[PDB]
Amino acid sequence: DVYAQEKQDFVQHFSQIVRVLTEDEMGHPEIGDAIARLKEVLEYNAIGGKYNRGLTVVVAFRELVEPRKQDADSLQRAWTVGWCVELLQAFFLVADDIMDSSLTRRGQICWYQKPGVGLDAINDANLLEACIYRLLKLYCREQPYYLNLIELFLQSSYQTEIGQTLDLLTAPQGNVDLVRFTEKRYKSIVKYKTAFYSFYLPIAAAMYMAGIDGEKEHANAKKILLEMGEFFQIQDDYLDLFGDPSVTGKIGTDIQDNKCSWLVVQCLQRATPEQYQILKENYGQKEAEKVARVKALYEELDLPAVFLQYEEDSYSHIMALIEQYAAPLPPAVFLGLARKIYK
Amino acid sequence: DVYAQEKQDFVQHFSQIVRVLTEDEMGHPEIGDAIARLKEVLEYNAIGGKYNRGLTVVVAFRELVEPRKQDADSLQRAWTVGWCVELLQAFFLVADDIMDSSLTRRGQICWYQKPGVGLDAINDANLLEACIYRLLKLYCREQPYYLNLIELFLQSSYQTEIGQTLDLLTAPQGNVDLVRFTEKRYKSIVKYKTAFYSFYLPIAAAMYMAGIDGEKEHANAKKILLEMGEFFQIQDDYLDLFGDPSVTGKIGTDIQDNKCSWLVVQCLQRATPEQYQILKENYGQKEAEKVARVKALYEELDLPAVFLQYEEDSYSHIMALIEQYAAPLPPAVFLGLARKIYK
Ligand SMILES: COc1ccc2c(CC(=O)O)coc2c1
Ligand SMILES: COc1ccc2c(CC(=O)O)coc2c1
Ligand SMILES: COc1ccc2c(CC(=O)O)coc2c1
Ligand SMILES: COc1ccc2c(CC(=O)O)coc2c1
C-alpha cells in the first residue's frame, strides 16, 4: 500500500538520476564514450527488482519527517538516496554473480554473461559503486547530514564485504565440507552480508535525513532491524526448497549450488551418523535424484515444523524489540517492514 | 634522497596499519576468520612496489607543513594517508590483472592466479578499497580536512574507473582494431586512468593536510601534475620497447599484448598504406618474429627520435608550468617529482 503508491514516483525518478549521471559529465566529450557505456550498465542492473530497499528509504522518510517539511527538494533527495541504496545492491549483485559463476538473475542473463561484457563487468560493478557518491555530492553536498550518509554507505559496503569473505571461506568452490556449516557461522554471514545493508542502511539513511543521528537511537534501530534481517534470510532459504515457484516466482537450487542454507545447517544439528552419511552424499549434486533425497531427509527431520516454530518465536521477539526500542521512532516504521517480510 | 630517507619510516608503519585493521576488528570474533584473510590480501598486494605514490604524500607533507608542526601525530597520519594511496593502487591492480588476464605482476604471480584465490580476488580487491576509508576514520576522523580526503579518494577512484572503461572500449579483448588508437583517445585514457591518482591525488592529499584547500590552488597543482602524468606514461610505453630490462627491471610486451601504446599511436599517424598494412599484420601476435617486425617499423619511422623530441619539449613546458602555477606551493614539491620521472 504505502509502498505501492510510492513506486510510481520512485521508478520515475530513475530517468533524472541517469540524466544527471551523464549530461553533467558530457561537459567533457573526451570521456563521452565511457559515459555511454555507464548508461548501459545502469539501465540494465539497477532496473528490474522490486526496489524494496530503495523504497524503504522513501517510505521511512515521509514518516520520520513532518508533513510540512517534505517539500519538493526534500523528496528529490530522498528518492536519490533511495536509488543509491538500490545502486549499492546492483554493485554487490553484479560482482557476486561473477564470483559464484551464476548464469541468471531475476530470470534474465547475468550482466557479465552477456556477449562482449565478460569480466569487464568487474569495472562496471565498480562504476556503480562510484555513482552512489557522485549522487550524494550532486544532491546532499550542502545538507547537514552529508558526511553521515557517505560514512553510512561506506560502512555498509565494508560490512557486506567482510560478510562476503566469510561466505567464501565457509563454502569454498570445490569443497563440499559440511563440517563448517555451523549455526553460529550462518548467523555471522547473514548479519554482515545481508541484514546490515538490507534493513539497517535503508532506515539509517532515512533517519539521518530526518536529523536523527543520535548514536543510541541508531543503536536501537540496528538492534530491531538486524533481527528482521536474520529472519528474512532464514525465510528465504526455507521458501527456496519448500516454497511454491508459481507464487515466489523463483526456482530453488540451494541444495544443488551446495549453499550454506539455514535448512542444511539445522539438518546437520538434529542428525545421526546415518543421516549425515546420506546428506554428505547427495548435497551439491546436479542429479534430480540426489536432490530429492536431501529434501526427504529434511522433511523427515521435521525441519519444516522447525521453521514454523522459529517464525512464531521470531515474530514475538521482534514485536517485543519493537515495543521497547522503537521510540523515539514511530513503531509504524518497523511494523510496516515486519508485515512485508512475515508473509 | 628525500625519498630514500623516508622509505624506512614508511614501510615500517605498515605493521601498525595492518595491526590496526585487524586487532580492533577482533572485538568481534565472529568475523575473525575473515579478518585473517584480509591480512593475507594486504601483506601480499600492498607490499612490494617502490611506494613512489605513497611516499609522495609523506615527502610533500614535510615541505608544505612548518617544521615545528610536524609532531608525532601529524607524521602518523601522513604515513597513513600515504598507505591509503598505496592501498587504492593495490585495489586497482588486483582488479585490472583479472580483467586483462595477466599472469604476473612485479615478477610475482598475480593474486587471483594463486591456488584457492581465483575470482574471489574480486572481493579481496573491494576489501582493499574499503580499508582506505576505515583508516581515514581511525586517524583523521577529527581532522578539519577529513571530508576533503574522503572526497579526494572517492573522486580519484571514479576517475580511474572512467579511464579504465575507456581503455576497455578502445582495445576490446578480441578486436585488433588499430583504427581507434588515436592520439586524442590515448591522452584521455592516460589522464583519467593514470595521471589523476598517480600524480594529483598524492599531492592533493598532502595539500589538504597542510590546510591548502583553495580550489584555484588545487586547480593549478592539477594543471602541472597532469602534464607530468602524461609524460610519465609516454615514457613508460617507450621504455617498454626500447628500454633495457637489466636497468628498467621489466620485460616489455606492449606489442604482443596488443596495447594502445604511445608508440603505436604515433606509428599510425606517420604512416602510409604500406606501413599500416604491415603493422596491422604483426600487432598483437605472440611470434618473436612478428614482434621484431613492428619494432623495426618504429625505428624506421624515427619514433625513438620523436620521443626524445617530445621529452625535450615536455621538460620545457613542465618547467614553464611550474614557474607559473607552483606558487603558493614550493617549487621543490614539483621539481622533486620531475627529477624522479625524467630519468
Ligand atoms: C528493507 O525492506 C525490505 C527488504 C527486502 C525485501 C524483499 C525481498 C527483496 O525484494 O529483495 C521483500 O520485501 C522486502 C523489504
Ligand atoms: C509460524 O506460524 C505463524 C502463524 C501466525 C503468524 C502471524 C500472525 C500475523 O501477524 O498475521 C505472524 O507470523 C506468524 C507465523
Ligand atoms: C607521484 O610520484 C611518482 C609516481 C610514480 C613513480 C614511478 C613509477 C612507479 O614506481 O610506479 C617512479 O617514480 C614515480 C614517482
Ligand atoms: C630528450 O632529451 C633530453 C635531454 C636533456 C634533458 C634534461 C636536462 C636535465 O634536466 O638533466 C631533462 O630532460 C632532458 C631530455
| Omega cis (within 30) before B328 | yes
Determine the 3-state secondary structure of A205 from DSSP: helix
Resolution rounded to one decimal, in angstroms: 2.7
**Closest by Cβ to B34, choosing from A30, A37, A165:** A165
A316 alpha-carbon distance from chain centroid: 23
3-state secondary structure of B16: helix
Q: Which member of B127, B151, B161 has the closest CB to residue A123?
A: B161
Q: Which residues contact A334 (CB under 8 A, 6 or more apart)?
A: A224, A225, A228, A318, A322, A326
Q: How does strand B104-105 pair with strand A104-105?
A: unpaired
Residue B150 amino acid letter: I
Tell me whether residue A22 is annotated as binding.
no
Specify whether the CB–CB gap between A161 and B123 falls below 8 A.
yes
Separation of A93 CA from ligand 4 center, angstroms?
A: 51
What letters, b where the CB count within 10 A reaches 16 and e where it falls short, cover B283-292?
Answer: bbbeeeebbe
Q: Is B199 annotated as catalytic?
A: no
Residue B96 is labelled as binding a ligand:
yes
* Distance in angstroms (rounded) separating the CA atoms of residues B270 and B264: 10
At position B102, the amino acid (one-letter code) is: S
Residue identified by cell 582494431 is B177
Determination technique for this PDB entry? X-ray
From CA B148, how far away is CA B120, in angstroms rounded?
Answer: 32
Burial B167-190 (b: 16+ CB within 10 A, else e): bbbbbeeeeeebeebeeebbbbbb
**Which of A119, A142, A147 is most worth mutating to test chain B (most B CB atoms within 10 A of its CB)?**
A119
Ligand nearest to the CA of B336: 3
Q: Torsions phi, psi of A119, nearest 5?
A: -65, -15
State CA A164 to chain mean position distance. Answer: 12
Burial of B342 (0-12, 13-18, 19+ CB in 10 A): middle
**Grid cell locating B213:** 584547500
Tally Cβ neighbours within 10 Å of residue B114. 13
Whether the CB-CB separation of B79 and B10 falls below 8 Å is answered with yes
| B305 close to B332: Cβ distance less than 8 angstroms | no
CA angle B135, B139, B142 (to 5 degrees): 125
The dihedrals phi and psi of A188, each to the nearest 5 degrees, come to -65, -35
B142: Cβ contacts below 8 Å, ≥ 6 apart: none
Does residue A311's CB lie within 6 angstroms of at least one atom of ligand 2? Answer: yes
Identify the residue whose cell numbers are 526448497: A241
Indicate the top mutation candidate among A302, A303, A311 to test ligand 2's pocket, ranked by most ligand atoms within 8 A of CB: A311
Q: Give dist(CA A261, CA A237) in Å, integer.
A: 6
Kindly list the distances between the CA atom of residue A144 and the CA atoms of A67, A150, A210, in Å, as whole numbers in the listed order. 20, 12, 10
Residues 6+ apart with CB under 8 A from A87: A42, A46, A128, A129, A131, A132, A135
- The Cα A146–Cα A242 span in angstroms is 44
Asked if B126 is an interface residue toward chain A (Cβ–Cβ < 8 A), one would say yes
B50 is catalytic: yes
d(C-alpha A211, C-alpha A329), whole Å: 12
> Residues 6 or more apart from A211 whose CB is under 8 A from it?
A144, A145
Interface test with A, best of B26, B30, B88, B164 (most A CBs within 10 A): B30
Q: Tell if the CB–CB gap between A34 and B99 is shorter than 8 Å.
A: no
CB spacing of A34 vs B162 below 8 angstroms: yes
First-residue to last-residue Cα distance in chain B:
15
Q: What is the DSSP string of B287-319?
A: -HHHHHHHHHHHHHTTHHHHHHHHHHHHHHHHH
Which positions in chain A touch B123 (Cβ < 8 Å)? Answer: 95, 99, 161, 164-165, 168
DSSP A115: T
Of the candidates A161, A122, A162, A125, the one whose C-alpha atom is nearest the C-alpha of residue B94 is: A122
- Which residues, other chains included, contact B220 with Cβ-Cβ below 8 Å and sequence gap of 6+? B325, B326
B272/A contact by beta carbon, under 8 A: no
How many whole angstroms separate alpha carbon A90 and alpha carbon A269?
35
Given the CA of residue A315, which atom of ligand 2 is nearest to it? Answer: 13
Q: How far is the CA of B229 from the centre of ligand 3 (A)?
A: 9
CA distance B336 to B340: 6
CA distances (Å), origin A12, targets A4, A41, A122: 13, 18, 28
Residue B195 contacts by C-beta under 8 Å, 6 or more apart in sequence? B225, B226, B228, B229, B230, B232, B233
Q: Do you know the residue count of chain B? A: 343
B52-64 vs B201-209: helix crossing angle, rounded to 10: 30
By the 8 A CB rule, do A99 and B120 touch? yes
CB proximity B161 to A under 8 Å = yes
Q: How many Å apart are CA A255 and CA A240, to the nearest integer?
A: 9
Spatial distance between the Cα atoms of A254 and A244, rounded to a whole number of angstroms: 14
Strand partners, A108: A105
Best to test chain B binding among A91, A110, A122 (most B CBs inside 10 Å): A122
**Whole-number Å distance between alpha carbons of A171 and A154:** 26
Note the maximum CA span of chain A: 68
Q: Cβ distance B82 to A109 under 8 Å? A: no
What phi and psi, each to the nearest 5 degrees, are found at residue A104? -130, 165
Provide the grid cell at A119: 569480466
Name chain B contacts of A32, Cβ cutoff 8 Å: none
Query: DSSP for B198-259?
Result: IIIHHHHHHHHHTT---HHHHHHHHHHHHHHHHHHHHHHHHHHHHS-HHHH-----TTTTT-
3-class state of residue A108 by DSSP = strand
Angle, alpha carbons B268-B269-B273 (nearest 5°): 65
Q: Pull the grid cell for residue B194.
A: 593514470
Ligand 1 residue neighbourhood (C-beta within 6 Å)? A 50, 52-53, 56, 198-199, 202, 337, 340-341
Residue A162 to residue B128: CA distance in whole angstroms: 11
Q: Measured between alpha carbons, how far is B156 from A236 in angstroms, rounded to an integer?
A: 38
Decide: residue B245, CB within 10 A, 0-12 exposed, 13-18 middle, 19+ buried.
exposed
Residue B32, C-beta contacts closer than 8 angstroms, at least 6 positions apart:
B26
Measured distance CA(A200)–CA(A152) in Å, rounded: 10
For chain A, say whether B31 makes contact (Cβ under 8 Å): yes
Q: How far apart are the first and last CA of chain A?
A: 15
Complete DSSP assignment for A279-335:
HHHHTT---HHHHHHHHHHHHHTTHHHHHHHHHHHHHHHHHHHHHHH-TTS-HHHHH
* Bridge partners of residue B104, in order along the sequence: B109
* Cβ–Cβ under 8 Å, residues B242 and B202: no
Q: Indicate the pairing of strand A104-105 with strand A108-109.
A: antiparallel
Which residues are within 8 A (CB) of A184 and not within 5 positions of it... i.e. 6 or more apart? B30
With CB atoms and an 8 Å threshold, state whether A162 touches B31: yes
CB B342 near ligand 4, within 6 Å:
yes
Closest-approach residue (CA) in chain A for B151: A133
Q: From ligand 1's centre to the CA of A337, what distance in Å?
A: 8
Fold of the domain built from segment(s) B1-343: Farnesyl Diphosphate Synthase (1.10.600)
How far is residue A229's CA from residue A190's CA, in Å, rounded to a whole number?
8
Q: Report which ligand 3 atom has the smallest distance to the Cα of B50.
A: 10
Q: Are A204 and A222 in contact (CB under 8 A)?
A: yes
Q: Which amino acid is at A120?
A: D
Cis status, amide bond into A328, omega within 30 of 0 = yes
Scanning B185-204 for CB atoms below 8 A from A yields 187-188, 191-192
Question: How many angstroms separate the Cα of A161 from the Cα of each of A154, B175, B255, B307?
Answer: 11, 34, 37, 45
The three-class DSSP label of residue A150 is: helix
Active site residue A213: no
- B53 CB under 6 A from ligand 3? yes
Contact residues for A273 (Cβ-Cβ < 8 A; gap 6+):
none
Angle between helix axes B4-23 and B52-64 (nearest 10 degrees) is 110
Q: How many residues does chain A have?
A: 343
The answer for A 281-320 residues in CB contact with B (under 8 A) is none
CA distances from A194 to A162, A230, B89, B202 (A): 11, 8, 28, 35
Instruction: Give the separation between CA B277 and CA B287, rounded to whole angstroms.
Output: 17
- B108, β-bridge pairs: B105
Which residue ranges make up each domain of chain B?
Answer: 1-343
Can you tell me the distance from the alpha carbon of B153 to that of A273, in angstroms, rounded to the nearest whole number? 54
Q: Measuring CA to CA, which residue among A176, A13, A158 is closest to residue A80?
A: A13
Q: How far apart are CA B267 and CA B183, in angstroms?
A: 10
**Which has the closest alpha carbon to B297: B317, B330, B318, B272?**
B272
Rounded Cα–Cα distance for residues A124 and A38 (Å): 7
Contact A168, A130 (CB under 8 A): no
Distance CA A228, CA A340 (A): 10
Inspect the interface and report whether the beta carbons of B157 and A118 lie closer than 8 Å: no
C-alpha to C-alpha distance for A249 and B203, rounded to whole angstroms: 53
Instruction: State the alpha helices, DSSP H only, in A106-182.
Output: 121-140, 146-170
B56 lines ligand 3 (CB under 6 A): yes
A140 Cβ contact list (under 8 Å, min separation 6): A77, A80, A81, A146, A149
Of B98, B124, B154, the CB nearest to A122: B98
Task: Copy the grid coordinates of residue A279.
Answer: 546428506
For every residue of B112-181, DSSP letters joined together read GGSTTTGGGHHHHHHHHHHHHHHHHHHHHTTSTTHHHHHHHHHHHHHHHHHHHHHHHHHS-TT---GGG-
